[PDB]
Design a protein around this ligand. Sequence first.
Ligand SMILES: NC(=O)C1=CN([C@@H]2O[C@H](COP(=O)(O)OP(=O)(O)OC[C@H]3O[C@@H](n4cnc5c(N)ncnc54)[C@H](O)[C@@H]3O)[C@@H](O)[C@H]2O)C=CC1
Ligand SMILES: Cc1cc2nc3c(=O)[nH]c(=O)nc-3n(C[C@H](O)[C@H](O)[C@H](O)COP(=O)(O)O)c2cc1C
Ligand code: SF4
Ligand code: FES
Lengths: 213, 85, 430
Amino acid sequence: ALFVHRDTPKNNPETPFDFTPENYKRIEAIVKNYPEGHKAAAVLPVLDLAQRQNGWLPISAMNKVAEILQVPPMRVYEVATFYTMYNRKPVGKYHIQVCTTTPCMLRNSDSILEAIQKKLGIKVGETTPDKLFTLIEVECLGACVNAPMVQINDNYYEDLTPKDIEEIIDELKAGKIPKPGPRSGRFSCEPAGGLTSLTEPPKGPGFGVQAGL
Amino acid sequence: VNNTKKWKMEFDTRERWENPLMGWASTADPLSNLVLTFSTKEDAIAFAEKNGWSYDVEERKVPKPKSKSYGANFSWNKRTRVSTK
Amino acid sequence: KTSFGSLKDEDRIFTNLYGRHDWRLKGAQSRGDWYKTKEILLKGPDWILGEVKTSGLRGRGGAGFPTGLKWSFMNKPSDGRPKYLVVNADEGEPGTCKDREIIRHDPHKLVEGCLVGGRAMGARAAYIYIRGEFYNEASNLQVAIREAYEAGLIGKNACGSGYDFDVFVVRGAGAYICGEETALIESIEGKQGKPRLKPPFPADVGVFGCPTTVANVETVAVSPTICRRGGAWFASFGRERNSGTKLFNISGHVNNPCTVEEEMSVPLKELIEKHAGGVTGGWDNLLAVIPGGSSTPLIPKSVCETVLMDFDALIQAQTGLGTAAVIVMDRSTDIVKAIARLIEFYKHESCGQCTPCREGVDWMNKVMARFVRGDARPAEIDSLWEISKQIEGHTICALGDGAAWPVQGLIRHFRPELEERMQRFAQQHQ
Ligand SMILES: NC(=O)C1=CN([C@@H]2O[C@H](COP(=O)(O)OP(=O)(O)OC[C@H]3O[C@@H](n4cnc5c(N)ncnc54)[C@H](O)[C@@H]3O)[C@@H](O)[C@H]2O)C=CC1
Ligand SMILES: Cc1cc2nc3c(=O)[nH]c(=O)nc-3n(C[C@H](O)[C@H](O)[C@H](O)COP(=O)(O)O)c2cc1C
Ligand code: SF4
Ligand code: FES
């Protein structure tokens, strides 16, 4: 929650970070997506790649991204503190993000925030003592018709009840990985009581194509 | 820049010493606080010559016209890119 | 045509919206995607821009700028810099979840839109700046882009037309402000997502300082269907200057919250009572509707009865169409808590660059947090109004406008509920 760095023994510029060689090949593929002379444009993916390897960002991943992209380190610190995904503290193995903006709040995200809190025994911002679950409270995740919903590390868990999110935390603690989908009867975003549209077969290639084409 | 609009006539500073009682800045210069204000340079020169004061004149230093462009912060190939904003 | 809506399934552009068909290349080619794309590209930039200008397509990102007039700004001879179409797939707007559906279920439609739009604007490559939270959607789109490269549809000699065109995907990292087009351009360039001032518009100095058009996923993915079906087919829907179809996200207090493709000038009551199953507790349980996602001001139940869901009828309803994200709020809603949570969103999602947003959106959030409890006096309503008018139009991008406008709509339609909140605070605490 702070935006200055203080050197701790676990977060200092001599904390060991280095990319794996397959991550260096991934970084070469990232840098080749941008014009020559604008290698700095690969700050945001490569830094996120540093978060996908290490789980979070000590200030040697920031220094390594600054060093291999030849940008100043402050230009990486600005990116790491601007964007809300770069974990500058080590989060748990499952990073639960509960959306509590108004479309998810109107469909009772508070009940699911409370159910996660009384299932995990923590509150918002805390980590469980076994380092498995970090519960925070995020803004809109772009799944508004699937309100209420959470995100766990890559995955959207949608149309949730307190019982559904208790079941999801149960099968996360059991080592398995749950299905990233709506826990209600529907599949992605359709009306729940049957399709109100798109009930016809699609017309296929060439339908309605104008003349002169 | 509202103080750079007018011409000023000051004088050479003389000795300011420590008052033995209080440490105050004692002076013997009557013209120590005398700053005269003129609209042009020639008015100040005519007033200095009228009163017999040997003067010297510095010329008015304006800032030169700069070339500004907000798009120049984001050039394709020039060094004038900003790396932060 | 005086009545609108009831769009037929043969007129849907976004078939396979719901994920019920194969999103991959075999599924997309049997729904009409990548059909005669070479014949579209070989008719040149001017024909495609004429089809988009003829269709009356307005920018689906939320502002509704005329899309063909926008894309014609790139139609100019080069000067050594490359040209870039950049696709805005960030979609941070509360209420809005439609571009996620296009990327997740119709990705080849977006890729063919990238090719057709970039041919129209002479663009060398496409950057699809996708939201970082949409990881599954971004990998989904990357699999579709791999299928498009292996079919020869993009890349070197795209569709056998002799036009070379790459399609890149750039993931965001958790900023709503990186949906704004110049802040998105700064976010692609490896910097903080702070909006550039305008001018230069991105067609002059855009991504990497090149000519660049940023366009929404929805206004890009409809463009090959416009070029195949004709601009007159697209313009035959909706009212005049409000042409075409639109994806709508009905969320909040409806029985069936859903994304649905509908004709443009459909009534709001018809849209809710047809595709969403009505307001929870019936239409008489309706308190307010935010018509187009968080930045548009709310409208009360008396305005929702007759209004049409296009740009012009909602500007006449002193709100905006926005992203066509219909948030429905029933009579049991604490509306000051909802609007204050929305302003709390706007201060957590504000980059901090210019003074009125950086200071005034936090100060509006503090005033709204006192308004929820009633911990205020009624002279602070009008003050807050003026605070909104000091942010509106004084900032760099329209996030300052998008934070002023819910405050203004809440005050304008629900001043007495604020006043009774404050006076019951004043009688139970003094
Ligand atoms: N889709 C979403 O997730 C979100 C959408 N919005 C919507 O976005 C809108 C505000 O966005 P803005 O881009 O600031 O709106 P608007 O002021 O800028 O301009 C719309 C588009 O037209 C272009 N344009 C306008 N005048 C031009 C000119 N003279 N020359 C060249 N290009 C020109 C701009 O570059 C821009 O791409 C609002 O209506 C808001 O509701 C807001 C937040 C989120
Ligand atoms: C704060 C802010 C956030 C925005 N976010 C998005 C967005 O997430 N997606 C989008 O398509 N447009 C967004 N816009 C609108 C863009 O500025 C721009 O108009 C649009 O992305 C491209 O224009 P188009 O509507 O013709 O596609 C946003 C605007 C602002 C001010
Ligand atoms: S008004 Fe807010 S969102 Fe826009 S440039 Fe300023 S700080 Fe950024
Ligand atoms: S409001 Fe929770 S996902 Fe958009």
